[PDB]
Design a protein around this ligand. Structure first.
Ligand SMILES: Cc1noc(C)c1-c1cc(NS(=O)(=O)c2ccccc2)cc(C(=O)O)c1
Ligand SMILES: [Cl-]
Length: 130
């Protein structure tokens, strides 16, 4: 219906706002664009599903997220990809892992404080009826 389309549009608006906030955070700069193959040529061979905050914005705009759970799965992937690609004890790896975990924690904390559980439940019920 028009009402259900209104619900998903509201979800997109909310998700764009959360993502923009995460994108303007200086700690998360390395996650704002896809990993450049000039800079990291073996990335695409090790990491099977690259994800970054610009791609998340693209996916919002393409109507790919119908629930906040589907969005958080992509935030989770940004984090897991960083942990997988940068697993060593050296400080460069530790720094990017800390930032990855902070990105994930920040997104979850924003959602916990600002997303009404009944709104998420409505989105899930519309999605499941599709
Ligand atoms: C992300 C990521 N995952 O594994 C690694 C390793 C990184 C990563 C990638 C880059 N270079 S980049 O071209 O792909 C880029 C620059 C600016 C914004 C977004 C991406 C730099 C660094 C860094 O710490 O400076 C880290
Ligand atoms: Cl830095």
């Amino acid at each position: 219906s028009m009402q259900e389309e209104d619900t998903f549009r509201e979800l997109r608006i909310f998700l764009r706002n959360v993502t923009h906030r995460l994108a303007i955070d200086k700690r998360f700069r390395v996650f704002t664009k896809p990993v450049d193959p000039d800079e990291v040529p073996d990335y695409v061979t090790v990491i099977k599903q690259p994800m970054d905050l610009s791609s998340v914005i693209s996916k919002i705009d393409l109507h790919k997220y119908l629930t906040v759970k589907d969005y958080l799965r992509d935030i989770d992937l940004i984090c897991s990809n960083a942990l997988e690609y940068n697993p060593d004890r050296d400080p460069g790896d530790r720094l990017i892992r800390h930032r990855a975990c902070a990105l994930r924690d920040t997104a979850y904390a924003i959602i916990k404080e600002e997303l009404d559980e009944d709104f998420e439940q409505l989105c899930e019920e519309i999605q499941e009826s599709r």
